[PDB]
Amino acid sequence: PDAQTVTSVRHWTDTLFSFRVTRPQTLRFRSGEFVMIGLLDDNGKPIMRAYSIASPAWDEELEFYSIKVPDGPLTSRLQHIKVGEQIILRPKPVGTLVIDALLPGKRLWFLATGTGIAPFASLMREPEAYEKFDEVIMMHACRTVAELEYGRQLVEALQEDPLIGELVEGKLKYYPTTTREEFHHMGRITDNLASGKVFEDLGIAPMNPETDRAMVCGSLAFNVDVMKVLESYGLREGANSEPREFVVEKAFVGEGI
Numbered sequence: 126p127d128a129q130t131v132t133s134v135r136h137w138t139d140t141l142f143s144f145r146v147t148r149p150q151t152l153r154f155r156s157g158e159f160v161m162i163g164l165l166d167d168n169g170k171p172i173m174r175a176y177s178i179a180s181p182a183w184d185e186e187l188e189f190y191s192i193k194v195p196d197g198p199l200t201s202r203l204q205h206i207k208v209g210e211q212i213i214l215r216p217k218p219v220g221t222l223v224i225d226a227l228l229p230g231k232r233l234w235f236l237a238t239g240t241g242i243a244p245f246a247s248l249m250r251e252p253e254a255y256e257k258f259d260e261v262i263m264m265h266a267c268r269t270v271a272e273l274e275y276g277r278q279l280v281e282a283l284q285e286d287p288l289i290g291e292l293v294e295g296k297l298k299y300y301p302t303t304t305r306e307e308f309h310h311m312g313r314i315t316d317n318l319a320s321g322k323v324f325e326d327l328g329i330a331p332m333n334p335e336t337d338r339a340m341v342c343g344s345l346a347f348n349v350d351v352m353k354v355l356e357s358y359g360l361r362e363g364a365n366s367e368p369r370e371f372v373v374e375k376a377f378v379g380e381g382i
């Protein structure tokens with residue numbers, strides 16, 4: 126188990142923060158995968174938790190998007206982490222949110238809620254996504270506007286980039302929504318896909334197995350409800366052994382805070 130150093134921290138809300146750490150020279154992974162990271166308790170025993178790598182495979186540094194669960198063994202501590210301090214990292218990537226587990230196609234959808242946007246923060250900055258697919262749709266649903274900030278700034282920086290800010294724009298469509306606070310676009314991913322509102326707002330054709338591929342990341346309940354909506358459009362679940370139209374992964378275990 127490696128010990129890497131925090132090089133920067135940013136707090137978004139009273140329950141969300143992101144940070145970057147040095148990457149082990151040897152660590153290799155595919156954008157979208159996750160690894161175990163953690164801290165030591167008081168007796169010096171490791172407290173490890175799965176975490177999607179929020180940064181792309183080519184990024185020399187590792188990024189993470191994290192929840193804050195006071196009373197949560199890991200994040201009650203991790204939320205206090207400072208630049209210069211370190212985290213325990215098991216350099217062994219895994220996960221079902223890899224491009225290789227999807228049949229090639231034209232449109233790739235990223236469906237996420239809460240911190241579930243983490244593996245897509247990585248995949249949206251992954252070159253392969255824009256060369257194996259013509260369009261990338263990022264649907265991010267959270268309760269408030271503030272919880273969408275991390276994703277917004279990330280997406281904004283890609284579209285404003287002097288060199289590719291225009292190459293991405295037009296190919297990457299950002300569709301954030303809130304379900305509690307007022308915002309120009311609201312509603313759950315499931316409802317907006319079922320009613321067809323999102324196809325409407327983005328001016329695109331309905332979803333179909335022939336052109337559409339999807340990756341889902343949220344609570345287990347979300348994942349289940351989303352799978353039903355996807356299957357009702359013709360798409361099917363795939364895997365690395367038998368690639369299909371969509372793949373899913375739990376954003377966290379339990380009902381979530």
Ligand SMILES: Cc1cc2nc3c(=O)[nH]c(=O)nc-3n(C[C@H](O)[C@H](O)[C@H](O)COP(=O)(O)OP(=O)(O)OC[C@H]3O[C@@H](n4cnc5c(N)ncnc54)[C@H](O)[C@@H]3O)c2cc1C
Pocket residue numbers: 159174175176177178190191192193194196197198199200201239240243244374375376377378379380381382
């Ligand atoms: C494949 C996989 C990947 C994950 N990737 C991330 C990630 O990139 N970032 C991240 O913050 N977490 C991620 N999680 C959750 C993560 O593993 C830990 O649960 C998180 O670090 C909280 O740990 P804790 O010890 O502070 O609280 P825990 O005791 O683990 O959880 C207490 C409760 O808080 C809630 N909770 C935990 N994590 C979240 C979350 N992210 N969002 C909303 N509610 C949550 C759940 O109800 C949980 O039961 C991932 C989980 C899995 C299974």
Ligand SMILES: Nc1ncnc2c1ncn2[C@@H]1O[C@H](COP(=O)(O)O)[C@@H](O)[C@H]1OP(=O)(O)O
Pocket residue numbers: 238239266267268303304305313314315344346347348350351380381382
């Ligand atoms: N089973 C589900 N299907 C679709 N959307 C969900 C589901 N469960 C929660 N959501 C939504 O995902 C987001 C994050 O929720 P949470 O913070 O509780 O984990 C919220 O917008 C929430 O919408 P809503 O507020 O309507 O439940």
Ligand SMILES: CCCCCCCS[C@@H]1O[C@H](CO)[C@@H](O)[C@H](O)[C@H]1O
Pocket residue numbers: 128164165166202209210211212213
């Ligand atoms: C020789 C032991 C190296 C431990 C590396 C993994 C990080 S461990 C981590 O470290 C922080 C300060 O760095 C502490 O504040 C925190 O409580 C502790 O869990």
